[PDB]
Amino acid sequence: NYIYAVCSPAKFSPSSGYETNLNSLLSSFVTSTAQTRYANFTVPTGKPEPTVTVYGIYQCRGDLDPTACSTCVSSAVAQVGALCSNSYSGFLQMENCLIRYDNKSFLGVQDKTLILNKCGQPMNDQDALTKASDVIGSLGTGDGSYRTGGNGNVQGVAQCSGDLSTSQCQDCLSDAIGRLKSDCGMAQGGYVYLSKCYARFSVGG
Ligand SMILES: *[C@@H]1O[C@H](CO)[C@@H](O[C@@H]2O[C@H](CO)[C@@H](O)[C@H](O)[C@H]2NC(C)=O)[C@H](O)[C@H]1NC(C)=O
Ligand SMILES: *[C@@H]1O[C@H](CO)[C@@H](O)[C@H](O)[C@H]1NC(C)=O
Ligand code: NA
């Protein structure tokens, strides 16, 4: 029910303020999905406190209705505890949403590092190869932080973490889409997840 989880080696102490603030942060994510598909939070609210302050975001796919966004984020919160347990930093990516938290702010910090890239099996079908090429490339020329394109039965999606600037988003996506095309462009789908953005496509289904 998830794509990847990243959990820091460094752990907070049991029943510490950090743990308590994290749990409060995560509950806040769920609440916030009623209003918006992306939000950033600090707990506690106010001046950073040594050790215990938590920073986080959630982000739903850019076309999700609030009900679908709540369901996804709730599930992410329910899963991240099991996977990341007492890590200071946790990042859980699902198909339709992510949650991310850390013990320092990561807002507006570019990070194009690769997390996960998987390609499908290979597609003489120049129609299919053309469509895939055109769809994947269309994601790069598209605007803003959530981009989709489709031709026939070929569908592409690209999304930047909501904290990135316009420029940072395009830079991240340029990399992700470049990798997606270069490595998976002849395949029956594929996905590239970088730290702060992703690009993916599917053929059929
Ligand atoms: C976030 O958590 C990490 C891990 O506790 C902090 O890094 C540690 O900092 C302490 C003292 O400040 C050092 O004794 C450790 O060597 C560090 N550990 C690691 C793995 O780097 C980091 O300072 C915390 N950041 C904030 C802003 O609280
Ligand atoms: C984070 O949230 C604050 C307060 O809600 C807002 O002022 C700011 O624009 C947000 N920043 C980012 C990078 O998401
Ligand atoms: Na969509």
Author numbering: 30 to 152, 155 to 236
Question: What do the authors say?
Answer:
The PDLP5 DUF26-A domain is N-glycosylated at positions Asn69 and Asn132 in our crystals. The N-terminal DUF26-A (PDLP5 residues 30–132) and the C-terminal DUF26-B (residues 143–236) domains are connected by a structured loop (residues 133–142) and make extensive contacts with each other. The resulting ectodomain has a claw-like shape with the β-sheets of DUF26-A and B facing each other. To assess the functional roles of the invariant disulfide bridges in PDLPs, we mutated the partially solvent exposed PDLP5Cys101, PDLP5Cys148, and PDLP5Cys191 to alanine. While the wild-type PDLP5 ectodomain behaves as a monomer in solution, the mutant protein tends to aggregate in our biochemical preparations and display reduced structural stability in thermofluor assays. These experiments and crystallographic data suggest that the conserved disulfide bonds in PDLPs and potentially in other DUF26-containing proteins are involved in structural stabilization rather than redox signaling. Despite moderate sequence similarity, the overall fold of Gnk2 and PDLP5 DUF26-A and B as well as disulfide-bond arrangement is conserved. Notably, Glu130 and Arg132 implicated in mannose binding in Gnk2 are replaced by Asp131 and Lys133 in the DUF-A of PDLP5, respectively. Despite these structural homologies of Gnk2, PDLP5 DUF-A, and PDLP8 DUF-A, we could not detect binding of mannose to isolated PDLP5 ectodomain in vitro. We are also unable to detect any binding of other water-soluble cell wall-derived carbohydrates to the PDLP5 ectodomain.
The Domain of Unknown Function 26 (DUF26; Gnk2 or stress-antifungal domain; PF01657)18,19 is an extracellular domain harboring a conserved cysteine motif (C-8X-C-2X-C) in its core. The third class of DUF26 domain-containing proteins is the PLASMODESMATA-LOCALIZED PROTEINS (PDLPs). PDLPs contain two DUF26 domains in their extracellular region and a transmembrane helix, but lack a kinase domain. We defined the structural relationship of tandem DUF26 domains by determining crystal structures of AtPDLP5 (residues 26–241) and AtPDLP8 (21–253) ectodomains to 1.25 and 1.95 Å resolution, respectively.
